[PDB]
Each structure stands twice: as structure tokens, then as C-alpha cells.
């Protein structure tokens, strides 16, 4: 449950991301694949090599969805219904993995938004990614 401060914190931080979200999407994945190699089991059809167009393209897709979620911070469940469906009924990624991508996205933002990555913003973003995670895994069973 995101507080008003949190929603603010999140909108500010993502606000700074701007035209780079896609690149940050890609970089988070790359960090995820190297750090938690088990996450690769969901992408056997991809080339996980550095700067792979597949990873790149996928980073964009993840970024855009995050953007959309920040924009509908108030109506997440609804803004991401289709994605919750896709993941629950088609992809079927085990829920433990959502914590792994979340962490990699923090790391990525930390490394690129030094001034903006304060302890309070760090707390908000974590809660945010947790909420996004919850929504995407809400129809699993």
C-alpha cells in the first residue's frame, strides 16, 4: 500500500528516467541474467549475450509497462490486467523471480540517478516494485 509520499517519490524518480527507461530496462535484465542465472530458464529462445537485440527490445517492453504503472499508480490492478493474465496463464514465471528483477531494477536506478536515489526514494521504489509484483502474480491461482 503506497502512501501519497511514495507515489510522489516514485513519479519524481521515474520522471528523471525519461528517454532512458528502455536502456535501464535492458541493463536491469542484463544484471539479472548474470547475477541470478536461474532466471535465464524463462528465456531459452533469446540470445542472452551482451547487447543482444532481444534483451534490448525486451528491456523496452518492461520499461514501458513500468511507466504505464507509474502513470496509473492509483489503478495498477486495472492498468496491468492484461499483463497479470499473460504471466498467470501463459508465461507462468515462478513468483520468486519477481523479487530478483525488482532488486536489479533498484541497482540500475541507483547507479544512474545518484542524486535522486535517497533512502526515502529507495524505500518508495522498493514498495512500488513489490506492488507491481503482487499485481502481476495475483491471478496465479
Amino acid at each position: 500500500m503506497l502512501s501519497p509520499a511514495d507515489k510522489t517519490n516514485v513519479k519524481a524518480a521515474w520522471g528523471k528516467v525519461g528517454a532512458h527507461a528502455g536502456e535501464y530496462g535492458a541493463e536491469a535484465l542484463e544484471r539479472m541474467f548474470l547475477s541470478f542465472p536461474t532466471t535465464g530458464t524463462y528465456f531459452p529462445h533469446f540470445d542472452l549475450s551482451h547487447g543482444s537485440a532481444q534483451v534490448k527490445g525486451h528491456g523496452k517492453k518492461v520499461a514501458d509497462a513500468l511507466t504505464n504503472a507509474v502513470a496509473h499508480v492509483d489503478d495498477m490492478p486495472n492498468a496491468l490486467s492484461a499483463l497479470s493474465d499473460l504471466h498467470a496463464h501463459k508465461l507462468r514465471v515462478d513468483p520468486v523471480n519477481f523479487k530478483l528483477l525488482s532488486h536489479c531494477l533498484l541497482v540500475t536506478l541507483a547507479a544512474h540517478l545518484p542524486a535522486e536515489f535517497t533512502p526515502a526514494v529507495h524505500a518508495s521504489l522498493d514498495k512500488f516494485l513489490a506492488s507491481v509484483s503482487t499485481v502481476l502474480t495475483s491471478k496465479y491461482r
Binding site: 542465472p37 536461474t38 507462468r92 515462478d94 520468486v96 523471480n97 491461482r141
Partner: protein, 146 residues
């Protein structure tokens, strides 16, 4: 693992009473029913639409028997699980692409199945020994992932 001798005996005594054929089918079916996401690997198994469809599917029962078969072997080399499971670990990773979290879910399901079957005989301390065992196998199975 860290199994005291008295833990290794209790594991072994009980295991003597298990019908690997039956327990195998039960554990695998229960997994596909409690954590439906795990069905992702078995779309060629057919109808897994309801609990009855899963539990009674001849393919699920057969697979379960295979899995528990391999696990029973693991119980005789409790000293070298990583060794024992190496080729299987490589296969689950490289060919099957099975996320290792699946192995921990299956372990927990197996413990419930053993509790279901043995009732009172599955004492607090016997479960503690089996918890160590299922964790070691899941670890062994994941050891070759890269």
C-alpha cells in the same frame, strides 16, 4: 547435508515403507494442482484442467514414478548427492530449462504427502530429517545450473 546418524536411520526406516510408485504420482499430481504454474512443463501430458484430471492422468502418474525413482536412488548416496544428481542437473538446466525453485516446491509437497500417508509416524523430528533431505536434493539438482 548435515544428517546426524540417528537422522539418517529415521529417514531410511520410513523410506522402507513407501510405495515409490504411488507416492510419486501423488507428489507430482499435487504439485500441478497446488502450484498450477508448474504445469508449464507438461503441456504434452494432456488434460490437467481439474484436480481429477491431473491426479488420474496416466502420464502424470508415470512421470511421478520416474522422478521418485531417481529420488530413491539419491537416498542411497546421501553422502554424494551432487555427484549422484549431476547429469540430471545438467539435463534440467540445459535441455528442460526447469527453474530450480520447482525442486523446492516439489520437496515441500513430498513432505505433505509423507505426512498424509504416515500420520502420527511422521513425528516432528522425522520431518526435520526429511526437510534436510529434500533441501539437499533440490540443491544437488540445481548445482549444475549456469
Amino acid at each position: 547435508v548435515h544428517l546426524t546418524p540417528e537422522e539418517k536411520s529415521a529417514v531410511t526406516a520410513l523410506w522402507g515403507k513407501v510405495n515409490v510408485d504411488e507416492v510419486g504420482g501423488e507428489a507430482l499430481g499435487r504439485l500441478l494442482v497446488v502450484y498450477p504454474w508448474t504445469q508449464r512443463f507438461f503441456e504434452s501430458f494432456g488434460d490437467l484442467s481439474t484436480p481429477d484430471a491431473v491426479m488420474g492422468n496416466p502420464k502424470v502418474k508415470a512421470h511421478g514414478k520416474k522422478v521418485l525413482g531417481a529420488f530413491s536412488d539419491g537416498l542411497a548416496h546421501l553422502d554424494n548427492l551432487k555427484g549422484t544428481f549431476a547429469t540430471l542437473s545438467e539435463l534440467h538446466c540445459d535441455k528442460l530449462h526447469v527453474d530450480p525453485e520447482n525442486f523446492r516446491l516439489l520437496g515441500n509437497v513430498l513432505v505433505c504427502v509423507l505426512a498424509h500417508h504416515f500420520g502420527k509416524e511422521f513425528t516432528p523430528p522425522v520431518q526435520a530429517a526429511y526437510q534436510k533431505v529434500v533441501a539437499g536434493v533440490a540443491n544437488a539438482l540445481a548445482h549444475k545450473y549456469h
